[PDB]
Structures are given as C-alpha cells and as structure tokens.
RNA sequence: AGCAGAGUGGCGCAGCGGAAGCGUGCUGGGCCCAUAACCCAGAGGUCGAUGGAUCGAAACCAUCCUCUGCUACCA
RNA sequence: AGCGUGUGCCUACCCUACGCCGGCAGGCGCGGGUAACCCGUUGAACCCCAUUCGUGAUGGGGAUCGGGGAUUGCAAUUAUUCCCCAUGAACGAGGAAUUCCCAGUAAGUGCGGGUCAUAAGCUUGCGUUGAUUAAGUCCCUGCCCUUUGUACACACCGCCCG
RNA sequence: ACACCAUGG
C-alpha cells in the first residue's frame, strides 16, 4: 500500500480490516462487510464461468518475478466485484474497441471493474452551426 | 417574561436564542430536524421553550446526546454515516466533520479515478441525469463569422 | 421586503399596554393584536389566552383558522 | 509651441452636486410561409490620469496627457 | 366514489385476504379468485374538524450532493425502481408575445387501462369539490354564397419595369 | 367618415 495509512501499520483499514486478513476470510464471511449491492450480487451469486477472470489472474501473478507485475489479463467482463484476491494484478477492460489497462489498487475494493474504463471522449465544443440558433436559418 | 439571554453559541455556529429549541439547533450541519426532535425527546427537554429559556446545564446535556448518539439508545439507523468506509464505525458527523468527510469522500474516490471521480473533477452531474436541455449556465453563441 | 420586527416575549412596556389595550378593541384577534404591537403572533395567541382566563375579555368566536374576542360585552 | 473645443458602453453622444443613460452596434428572442422593416431581453463603464475642496461628484479647482479646428509657421 | 383489470394456449408472469417478523422498503406462512362469488361495503385525495409556526428564502420550495439498507434480473457502473439519516440551489407571480375554454363545462383533486421481469413528470378513461364572464359581432385570423375587376392558371408564396 | 403593409429556389 502506497500512502502513510490506508491498510499500513497507522490506522486505516477497509470496513474495520486489512488486507491482510481480507485475504483470510472466506466469501461469506467477506460479504458481510461489501455495501448492499455487492452481498446481493454474492448472495444469488454463483458467478458462472465468470471464474475464468479469478484464474487466469492468479497463475500470472505466479510466474510473475519477484519485485516486477504482472502483464495485462484482458476482458470483457466488465462488472466484476473486485474482490480482495484480485489486488495487485495488472487487467485490460474492453472499451467498446480498445482494452485499456488498470492497475488493481486496493481502494478499487467492492467497486465495478467497468467503472475504469469510460466509454466516450470527454466533449469539447466546436463552434455552433448553420441550424443552432432559430434565427440562424437562410440560404438564397 | 423571561428577561434573560437568549442567543448561545453552540460548537462553532451561532444558534439563534429565538426559535422553538427544536427549530433552533438546526441552524448545526449534519443536524436536520428529524434528529433534532430524537435528540431533544431523549433529552427530555419540553418542546415549548425556545433557545432563550434553557440554562447551562440543559444545553450539555442536548450536545453530549447529538456527538454520542449510539449510546443514548438512537438506533443505528438514524446516523448520517454508517461502516464508515474507512474504519467500520457508525456516527453522525456534525459541523466541520461533514465538510471534512465530504472532502475526504471526493479526494477517495479521484484518486483512483472512478468514473464519479473523474465526473466531480470535470464539474458535470454525477448521478444518471441527462445534460443536454440542464443546468444550462453557461453564455449564449452566435452564428456569425 | 423589510425587517418586520417582533418579540417573542414581552417587556414591561408592552406588558403595561397588553393588561391595559382590553378596553381600547373591539375587535381582538390575534393579528390586530400581533400588528399594533410588536408581536410575534405566536405570542399574541398566548397573551390572549391569558386575558381570556382572566375573564377580560369574551370569546365571541374559535376556529381552526380563525380566532375573534370582544370589549366586555358592555357598554 | 499657442488659442479654442472635447475626453463617459465597440462607435457617435446626453448628463446646471443626492450621481450610468440615449442613438447605433453585438448576442438572443418575438412577429411572418419565409426575408427586410417593426417589437423586447442580455452583456459591455479605471466617466483620460493624478491630487484637493465639499457631508457627499463623472461634473468644481490645480497639474499633466491624449484627439480635433484655426493662426503661429518658429537659427 | 366511479370506470376497470386479475393465474398467459409457445411465452411461462397473475390480483391479493388473514397470521407472524422488521422503524421503513421488505421477508416468511397459509387460504380465496378463471371472477356481481375472492381482493372489496373497493375505509382514495382534495375537502371537513382540532394543534404548532408568524411575513423572515421561514418549518415556503425541494434541486444538487455524502453515507447505508432491500426487491427485480443472467447482469444495475453512466447511480432501473424503492426506503432512511444528512446537504438545502434557483424561485417573492414572470418582457415582447401567445394557447384552451360556455355548465356539471374551466380549474383543483385523486383512481384504474396501455407499455409493464422491475416501472410514469406520458397518454387513454373514471369519478370527486365545482366558479367568474357571454347569449354577441364581423374589428382581427379564417371560412361559405352572389355581383364585379385581372396582363395570374406552377394560380398573389402569381406576374413584372428600369 | 383614409399613418405605415416592400419582396419570393
Ligand atoms: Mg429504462
Ligand atoms: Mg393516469
Ligand atoms: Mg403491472
Ligand atoms: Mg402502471
Ligand atoms: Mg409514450
Ligand atoms: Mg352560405
Ligand atoms: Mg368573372
Ligand atoms: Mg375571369
Ligand atoms: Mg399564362
Ligand atoms: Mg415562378
Ligand atoms: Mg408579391
Ligand atoms: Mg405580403
Ligand atoms: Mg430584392
Ligand atoms: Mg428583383
């Protein structure tokens, strides 16, 4: 963790814990921490094949050497709880067209993965045209 | 009739001494007035004096009820702030807490550049609304070249 | 839009010119009393109340929506 | 260098101490099937700069600067 | 109060009584209805009666925003909908212009149908409290009939002169 | 018992 605090030895954590136990507790009693949306999604949530995402992250976070990360695991599956073995691991989320990356921080916890990955330009605006304005109209 | 002070000044706002008691500690963030009247019920205070006509002590007991609600027997879900994100803890934050929290829920989530961060930053609306036909501040554009 | 001030309890003054105004109405309602005074209205209602107790003066008329009194019923 | 006049909204200007508008222009809207004319809203101000009097000024007084007309035209 | 709808032929879901649990959304349990039979005597809102506030952007108004809790679904992030605490903006009857309307009508007020896994600031119907002003005219915008004039007939949004 | 009423891919 990267600042004074936010899961260090200084206090703070994520609900009332750190990542640490985080990692040593088990779905159920994990989702008694997640926001209400996050349980239900747990609760009904047999996650089907989207098991693939959870494997395919470790097995990468393995081979990776020591003090390096991992390369980028890319997807599709943009609403995925991150959960708190999915911390560290280097994903691509799928745009539309591009997959741009994200580094797993461990405040993105109980977020959406698609909620990093925006799908549209930031709008700037042009100039406004021959119909903008109800006086604007007349060609000879 | 009662003749003496009205106005006081409770943790860093001035409460006007004239309003009824209940109407009169709202003027506290974080404090609405459906919690106010938890307060002063739990307080036991009468509902029909105004600010002016309660002394020293009373007014103690009132703030020591709003900063430690849990304990005075308010439920878990009347506070403001409940497992709070960083700590678990239940609370209502009061009056200089509320612009903190408040700051410190907009720098969380830009830092890591949620799609509400980046939406705060940009200054735009952060819930679903359409933005094409509101808020509309901005100044008129001509035609003309 | 101006500053319509008004008390919320009495001082002596007005104290004086409440136990004092009886005679002077005819009509008493808690609104030529709040504007002829410097009378909150919530505090017209109570001073009144008191009168009344005091048979000085007589209901002639409460509603919800409106109150009335009279002199004495003399006179 | 001198006389006289002026310095205020983009531009022409009004404003005899209780203090910022007019004509036009710009942006937008109204009217008509459209377009001009006509109608209405909005933005735009170091009242040339510096001091002083006055309870108080854009206005009065003093100094300086900048435009315009007319003579002077000046080693 | 009044018009209504209600277990779905693939398709796969209906309206809900009564008991219990939870502040609330909601959850569990166990019956009725293929319907003048059950929801249902459809305990609807405005209105009606009594209490607090007091001319103050105030307790008017409820935008924007923080945190949390449920239901639908394969999936809710750009927050489907819903509930709670909190935040508390413009707005003090609206310039030039311009819309609809004649009696159970205008307006106020809520309730069903459609779409509908979830679900009206819409629309289509229903009742409920219920006015002011008119009984006219051809002025304005248009319409119908006769007479009359025309260089128009793609028909005055026409045609045409320097 | 007559203010102003121009034009048309
Ligand atoms: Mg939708
Ligand atoms: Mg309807
Ligand atoms: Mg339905
Ligand atoms: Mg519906
Ligand atoms: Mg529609
Ligand atoms: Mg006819
Ligand atoms: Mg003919
Ligand atoms: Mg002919
Ligand atoms: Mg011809
Ligand atoms: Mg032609
Ligand atoms: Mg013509
Ligand atoms: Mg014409
Ligand atoms: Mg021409
Ligand atoms: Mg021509």
């Known amino acids: 963790v990267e600042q004074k605090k936010k899961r260090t030895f200084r206090k703070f954590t994520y609900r009332g814990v750190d990542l ?3 990692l040593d507790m088990s779905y159920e009693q994990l989702m008694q921490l ?3 949306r996050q349980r239900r999604r747990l609760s009904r949530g047999l996650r089907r094949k989207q098991h693939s995402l959870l494997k395919r992250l470790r097995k990468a976070k393995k081979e990776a050497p020591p003090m390096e990360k991992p390369e980028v695991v890319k997807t599709h599956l943009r609403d995925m709880i991150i959960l708190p073995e999915m911390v560290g691991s280097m994903v691509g989320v799928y745009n539309g067209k591009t997959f741009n990356q994200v580094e797993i921080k461990p405040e993105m916890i109980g977020h959406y993965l698609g909620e990093f990955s925006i799908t549209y330009k930031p709008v700037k605006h042009g100039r406004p045209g021959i119909g903008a304005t109800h006086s604007s109209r007349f060609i000879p | 009739p009662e003749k003496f002070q009205h106005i006081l000044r409770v943790l860093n706002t001035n409460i006007d001494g004239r309003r009824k008691i209940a109407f009169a500690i709202t003027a506290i963030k974080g404090v609405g007035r459906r919690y106010a009247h938890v307060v002063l019920r739990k307080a036991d205070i009468d509902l029909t004096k105004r600010a002016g006509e309660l002394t020293e002590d009373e007014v103690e007991r009132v703030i020591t009820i709003m900063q430690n609600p849990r304990q005075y027997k308010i439920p878990d879900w009347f506070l403001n ?6 700590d678990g803890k239940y609370s209502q934050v009061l009056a200089n807490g509320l612009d903190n929290k408040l700051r410190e829920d907009l ?5 890591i550049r949620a799609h509400r961060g980046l939406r705060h930053f940009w200054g735009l609306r952060v819930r679903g609304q359409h933005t094409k036909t509101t808020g509309r501040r901005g100044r008129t554009v001509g035609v003309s070249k | 839009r101006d500053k319509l001030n008004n008390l919320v ?8 010119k409440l136990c004092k105004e009886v005679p002077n109405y005819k009509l008493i309602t808690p609104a030529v009393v709040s504007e002829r005074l410097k009378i909150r209205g919530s505090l017209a209602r109570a001073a009144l109340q008191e009168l009344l107790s005091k048979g ?3 209901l002639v008329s409460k509603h919800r929506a409106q109150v009335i009194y009279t002199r004495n019923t003399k006179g």
């Open chain 3, 9 to 16: 309890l009495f001082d002596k003054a007005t104290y004086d």
């Open chain 3, 56 to 58: 000085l003066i007589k």
């Open chain 2, 81 to 86: 702030r409940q497992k709070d994100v960083k």
């Open chain 2, 107 to 111: 720098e969380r989530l830009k830092k």
């Open chain 1, 34 to 36: 997640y926001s209400a």
């Open chain 1, 20 to 22: 640490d136990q985080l």
